[PDB]
Amino acid sequence: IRRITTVPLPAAPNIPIIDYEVSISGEWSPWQAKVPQIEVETHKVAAP
């Protein structure tokens, strides 16, 4: 797709295109921003 497309794509070398989301604004944005880092209770460490 990057070869045949005219639409700009993400300009980060070692990231697949599938790892990026399209924001409501036109520009791309990585999915990694939308995944929080949480803390799990000791009660449910293996069955959350």
If binding is defined by CB under 8 A, does position 18 make contact with other proteins? no
Dihedral in degrees, nearest 10, Cα atoms 36, 15, 30, 41: -10
Strand residue runs (E) in the chain = 20-22, 28-30
Among 24, 35, 38, 47, binds other proteins (CB under 8 A): 24
**Shorter beta-carbon distance to other proteins: residue 5 or 37:** 5
Tell the smallest beta-carbon distance from residue 3 to other proteins (Å). 10
CA 6 to CA 16: how far, in whole Å? 18
Give contact residues for other proteins (rule: CB under 8 A): 1, 4-5, 24
